Amino acid sequence: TRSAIRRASTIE
Amino acid sequence: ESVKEFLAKAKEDFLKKWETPQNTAQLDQFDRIKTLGTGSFGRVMLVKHKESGNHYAMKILDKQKVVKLKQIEHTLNEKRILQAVNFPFLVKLEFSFKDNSNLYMVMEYVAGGEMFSHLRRIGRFSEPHARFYAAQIVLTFEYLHSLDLIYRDLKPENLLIDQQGYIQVTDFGFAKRVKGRTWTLCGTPEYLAPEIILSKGYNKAVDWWALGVLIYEMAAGYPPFFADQPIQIYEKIVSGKVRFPSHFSSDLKDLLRNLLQVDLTKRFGNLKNGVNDIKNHKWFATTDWIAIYQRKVEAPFIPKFKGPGDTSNFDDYEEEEIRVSINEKCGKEFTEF
Ligand SMILES: Nc1ncnc2c1ncn2[C@@H]1O[C@H](COP(=O)(O)OP(=O)(O)NP(=O)(O)O)[C@@H](O)[C@H]1O
Ligand SMILES: [Mg+2]
Ligand SMILES: [Mg+2]
């Protein structure tokens, strides 16, 4: 399996 | 023009539902089955309507943390825009409601999974494969931008693949009706336009920048600007510097340079001809735009599912009890939801 790190939205 | 008349009717439909804004279901009516994705303010779960048997994806937002983090207008925007838009690549909202603790948006379940997981597994999409997904995004932005809507969080994790292999855009958390400039720092770091980072006030052009990051990541397997610390990511974005895999076509490189243009005087999608500069670009010369809209193109990849409510196309998440207080919380702040 390959890494798959989801990216979270960001606010201030 | 056929397109212009189409958009004008789309606007009429939208403004009608835009003033339709209540409580069209209740939590009681759904079995909660599995978490599909977790976020900062809650989670999305696979649910099943107990009486009809239909499955849906329910986003749960915690009202208190939403208030604490100055996200009330964003949350009201998200639900109001999702109920009023209508387009073949925008996820449908079937129900929405609120209780003592949470806001709930019940969407159609897109069982194919995130574009992100197929992309990481396959490694990278071919240029025709990437172009197929991109075409749908170009038409979607033309539609939303036509209604003065900015989307503001394009990324593979927010793009779901349906049973025909087409895209369903979800996560309208930062969508906003905007004529002119807006100023909120929001989006996802690897995808933010420079004008957002530099706090210059921005418009729909930030969506066309994000499309360039999306196309780059789909085709390369990784985004054009990434680093360990987001400060370094922002330095790259702002620098006006992008290196392309040698395996990219010259046409792909030229389109990306014009979308990843930090100068707004030059960024495609923001010039005099608007979205037509993108539609007319040589990278898209083989794209039948009407066929894509009509969903008549054979998709390059169709995910597999084993009947309704199958979740194999999603990562597994730590489950938890859904906390609903005995006392109403933040009633006044969410009256319009
Ligand atoms: N309609 C849907 N059908 C199936 N899965 C969905 C649906 N909507 C969302 N998801 C999944 O749930 C995840 C979280 O939904 P999302 O709307 O992105 O919440 P979020 O808290 O705003 N995440 P983010 O802002 O990107 O950090 C998505 O990335 C998808 O994996
Ligand atoms: Mg998301
Ligand atoms: Mg979001």
Residue numbers in the entry:
A (entry chain B): 8 to 19
B (entry chain A): 13 to 33, 35 to 350
Give the text the authors published on this PDB structure.
Our structural models for the three complexes all show a monomeric form of PKAc that forms a 1:1 complex with PLN, which is consistent with the solution behavior of PKAc.
The hydroxyl group of the phosphorylation site, Ser16, is ~3.4 Å away from the γ-phosphate group of AMP-PNP, similar to other reported PKA structures. Arg14, from the classic R-R-X-S/T motif, forms extensive interactions with PKAc, involving a salt bridge network with Glu170 and Glu230 and van der Waals contacts with Phe129, Thr201, Pro169, and Glu203 of PKAc, similar to what was seen in previous studies with other peptides known to bind PKAc. Ile18 forms extensive van der Waals contacts with Gln84 and Phe187 of PKAc.
